[PDB]
Design a protein around this ligand. Structure first.
Ligand SMILES: [Zn+2]
Lengths: 505, 450
């Protein structure tokens, strides 16, 4: 029926007063970060040159306290620099890299893919977004004239859609990178709609209206103290350019303002917001009749986009093959059509941690529960535990062999491991005479531990592989010790784990 | 010295021959501390605080004086000294999970009892000294004790000369704590006669209650004063009988009258006089600038929670108390956000004895700032990058500081642990036990910082 009450755990904290405005400034892009400004002011460079510019930035902050550091590290360090807040009138911490005293944090951090390759990270304090959206900006006269010609939300939206180096590649591919430190203010969903047969645009626009309806129902369910009238609440839709000529997939991006007075905090919280918005439109009748005959699968929303360091291609940008351009689905009772059209061009409407657009109270949905085990999975798990048996966790099984210390148990069985290496791989057996076990992966079902003494591939004869001992619980609650090797040569999937032998302990 | 020291000083043992007194900060009363330093110089011949405990007696003549003082005492205290084990407290007190009220409570203290007792025992062992002229160092201690109430400069000297002397001669501790044990015994004996009831304390300082009707105050002053008179006179009589004579006549201080009193640990006690709303909290560690705000929050929450004496079933009061305690925690963590960028405020003073965070290789570059670190290391735990929490020695970097956001998800957890001991103690002490007040910081209000 829409699911939300029975499969989500709303955890909010109300903050009224100065802590509301203070919290907002601390967790949202600065008021001028996404306010169109004449030119860019930021730090745009390839990953290599940014490691250097970050190293040199640390040498002007380490003197005054900054803990010293000893493409994931670069993104983490840039996000931490962008998140750091201004202490009074003193220039912010990122001012060392951006080299201006007018910089105001927090700030957006983007990733630019260049040709032939090269992830160029770019942290900006302001940018020429007026120029980027200028191509899809329709003048008030044009929208008003179209409204007079077609007095009908759907028809006008179909008509209004028809009328539409790292520093230079910033303007061809910019991908916003999720910052877990900041608070998310817009529900940005990446709809990857697979297509059996091509879908006409008239169909997609009617499907998108149904999606708006379902998503607004889901939003009024998730945020119960808000007021989402599902005929006036603005949802923004953006289609990837290919009449739709698309054959394989339709690229869609749906942006929703988080209704006041709510602000959503947490990657997992938006993972829920996205999974509640998915079921709503799947249970919706009109949407699955409108797009069903054309869609191969009903998996539309990708929920992994929301993780610190994961980027999402912004609208009004291409991919290095399709510039995301708005598709206008006017609200059925929208009282300002020209405003709605000239609302898709404002970067705040499509930024994860944008400034929220006199706050008395503010409710932060910071938890919608943990990983969603399907009522089907939860009921599947409780029913499997009652028919087949209990599979004890890794920690409990290891506890039997006096391990509360994994790197020491590994040493005792390392002899068995090296003996099987001598028996089946004797040409590389002696490299495994003096080895130190350093933890690699630590889970509740998997424990990978390396053996650095560049060792040799035991499968082919390509100094090419890294060895990893992996402990899991198999069979009748017995400990299975697997030697695994990750090589680099293409014959062996580039830097991919491959097992070679698995013995008991 | 490697491990440093409590009191700043700069000795002039040779060239140029001019004493130089370091007077730390204290701008408002700069003349007062200058006069205190001058008096400390003049009295103890300038040896203090450089020479140490040797101003009084050689560190090795003490083993003789302590033995010579264990003989001139009374037969009972002679054994009482020999049976002293660290923290024995052989006196009827309250169970540490307990609380009292509304009954007329009162705190008492003997100003400078360890120093005065040390002086009397030093005189008892004075005959045992090799040189009668070698007792001049035993005249400076009496000058300190005599002038202690008159001038506070002798005070800070005596609060450090005495504990350090007790470290110079380990055998003096078992003597001083046996004499104080005897004092506490007569305190308890005399207490019953004047309706006083020993409920807690640490020797020289002791707090108790009165078996008077808990509504009359005109006669309350009379009993509270007669108890002071009788206890002071009886303790003085025991000391005289123990041959130990004090230079400054003994005096008991009425350090406050209160109606409610709640204790959780051995040192943690909160007193509150409802009539005048005067309170006193002890046992809460002031390990930084945030702990003071936490203490204020606790002393307001306790003032509001013992104001719930409205007639109710005990079960109801437990819940309407826990709710208010959780609300106080909420208002504390909300205000914590508005000072998340004040690293100096979220700072902890680590001692050179406690386990300490490892020094970053860039704190060794403070120039003329590394010299200020003598006793305390002020550390703030910041969270660079992600996952890792690293310590920054605050006072070894130039100001204004630039830092990654302060890991309030570590300091607030520690402050909340202390506030939780105080609140588990009060919840399980006034109303029915069985409730460990825990605030779900990790779920309710963790998002603000992490
Ligand atoms: Zn290989």
């Amino acid at each position: 029926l829409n699911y939300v009450k029975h499969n989500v755990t709303p955890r909010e904290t109300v903050l009224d007063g100065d802590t509301a405005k203070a919290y907002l400034r601390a967790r949202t892009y600065a008021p001028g970060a996404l306010t169109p400004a004449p030119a860019y002011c930021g730090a745009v460079d390839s990953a290599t040159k940014m490691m250097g510019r970050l190293a040199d930035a640390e040498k002007l902050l380490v003197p005054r306290g900054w803990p010293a550091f000893a493409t994931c590290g670069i993104v983490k360090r840039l996000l931490r620099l962008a998140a750091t807040e201004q202490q009074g009138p003193t220039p912010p911490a990122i001012a060392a890299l951006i080299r201006n005293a007018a910089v105001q944090t927090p700030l957006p951090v983007y990733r630019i893919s260049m040709v032939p390759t090269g992830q160029a990270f770019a942290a900006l304090a302001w940018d020429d977004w007026a120029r980027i959206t200028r191509d899809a900006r329709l003048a008030e006269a044009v929208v008003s004239a179209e409204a007079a010609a077609h007095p009908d939300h759907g028809a006008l939206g179909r008509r209004l859609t028809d009328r539409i180096d790292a520093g230079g590649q910033m303007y061809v591919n910019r991908n916003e990178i999720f910052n877990g430190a900041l608070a998310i203010t817009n529900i940005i969903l990446d709809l990857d709609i697979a297509l059996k047969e091509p879908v006409p645009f008239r169909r997609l626009h009617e499907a998108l209206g149904h999606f708006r309806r379902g998503a607004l129902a889901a939003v009024q369910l998730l945020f119960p103290a808000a007021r989402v009238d599902p005929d006036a609440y603005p949802c923004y839709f953006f289609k990837s350019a290919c009449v739709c000529s698309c054959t394989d997939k339709i690229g869609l991006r749906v942006c929703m303002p988080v209704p006041a007075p709510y602000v959503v905090h947490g990657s997992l919280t938006m993972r829920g917001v996205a999974r509640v918005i998915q079921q709503a439109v799947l249970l919706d009748r009109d949407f699955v009749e409108a797009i069903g005959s054309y869609v191969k699968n009903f998996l539309l929303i990708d929920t992994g986009v929301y993780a610190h360091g994961h980027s999402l291609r912004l609208p009004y940008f291409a991919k290095i093959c399709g510039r995301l351009l708005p598709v206008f689905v006017i609200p059925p009772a929208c009282k300002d059509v020209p405003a709605f059209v000239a609302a898709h061009a404002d970067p705040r409407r499509f930024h994860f941690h944008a400034p929220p657009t006199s706050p008395r109270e503010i409710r932060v949905l910071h938890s919608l529960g943990g990983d969603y085990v399907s009522f089907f999975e939860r009921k599947a798990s409780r029913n499997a535990l009652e028919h087949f048996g209990r599979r004890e966790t890794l920690t409990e099984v290891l506890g039997r062999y006096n391990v509360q210390t994994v790197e020491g148990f590994a040493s005792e069985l390392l002899g068995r491991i090296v003996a099987c290496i001598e028996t089946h791989f004797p040409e590389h057996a002696g490299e495994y005479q003096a080895v130190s076990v350093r933890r690699a992966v630590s889970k509740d079902d998997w424990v990978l531990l390396q053996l650095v003494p560049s060792l040799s591939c035991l499968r082919f004869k390509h100094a090419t592989a890294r060895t990893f001992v992996a402990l899991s619980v198999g069979a009748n609650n017995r400990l299975c010790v697997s030697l695994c090797q990750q090589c680099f040569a293409a014959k062996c999937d580039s830097n991919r784990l491959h097992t070679l032998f698995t013995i008991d302990a | 010295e490697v491990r440093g020291g409590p009191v700043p000083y700069f000795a002039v043992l040779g060239f140029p021959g001019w004493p130089t007194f370091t007077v730390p900060a204290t701008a408002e009363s700069a003349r007062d501390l200058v006069r205190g330093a001058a008096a400390a110089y003049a009295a103890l011949l300038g040896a203090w605080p450089a020479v140490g405990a040797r101003v009084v007696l050689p560190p090795r003549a003490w083993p003789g004086v302590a033995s010579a003082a264990a003989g001139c005492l009374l037969p009972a205290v002679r054994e009482a000294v020999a049976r002293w084990h660290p923290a024995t407290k052989i006196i009827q007190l309250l169970d540490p999970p307990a609380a009292v009220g509304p009954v007329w409570t009162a705190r008492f203290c003997f100003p400078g009892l360890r120093a005065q007792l040390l002086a009397a025992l030093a005189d008892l062992g004075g005959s045992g000294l090799a040189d009668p002229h070698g007792r001049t160092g035993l005249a400076r201690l009496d000058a300190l004790v005599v002038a202690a109430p008159s001038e506070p400069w002798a005070g800070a000297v005596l609060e450090r000369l005495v504990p350090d002397t007790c470290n110079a001669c380990p055998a003096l501790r078992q003597l001083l704590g046996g004499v104080m044990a005897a004092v506490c015994l007569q305190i308890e004996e005399t207490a019953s006669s004047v309706k006083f009831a020993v409920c807690g304390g640490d020797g020289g300082a002791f707090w108790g209650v009165f078996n008077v009707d808990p509504q009359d105050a005109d006669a309350a002053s009379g009993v509270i004063e007669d108890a002071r008179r009788a206890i002071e006179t009886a303790v003085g009589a025991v000391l005289r009988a123990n041959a130990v004579r004090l230079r400054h006549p003994l005096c008991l201080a009425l350090e406050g009258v209160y109606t409610h009193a709640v204790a959780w640990s051995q040192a943690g006690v909160w007193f509150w006089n409802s009539r005048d709303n005067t309170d006193h909290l002890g046992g809460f560690p002031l390990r930084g600038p945030a702990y003071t705000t936490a203490a204020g929050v606790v002393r307001d929450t306790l003032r509001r929670v013992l104001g719930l004496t409205t007639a109710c079933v005990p079960e109801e009061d437990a819940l309407t108390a826990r709710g208010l305690m959780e609300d106080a925690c909420d208002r504390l963590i909300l205000d914590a956000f508005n000072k998340r960028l004040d690293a100096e405020y979220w700072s902890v003073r680590v001692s050179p004895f406690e386990a300490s965070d490892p020094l970053p290789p860039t704190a060794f570059r403070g120039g003329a700032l590394l010299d200020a670190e003598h006793y305390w290391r002020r550390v703030v735990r910041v969270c660079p990058g992600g996952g890792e929490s690293v310590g920054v020695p605050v006072d070894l970097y130039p100001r204004p500081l630039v830092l990654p956001p302060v890991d309030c998800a570590h300091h607030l957890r520690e402050i909340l642990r202390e506030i939780e001991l105080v609140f588990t103690g009060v919840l399980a002490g006034v109303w029915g036990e069985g409730g460990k007040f825990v605030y779900p910081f990790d779920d309710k209000m963790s998002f603000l910082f992490a």
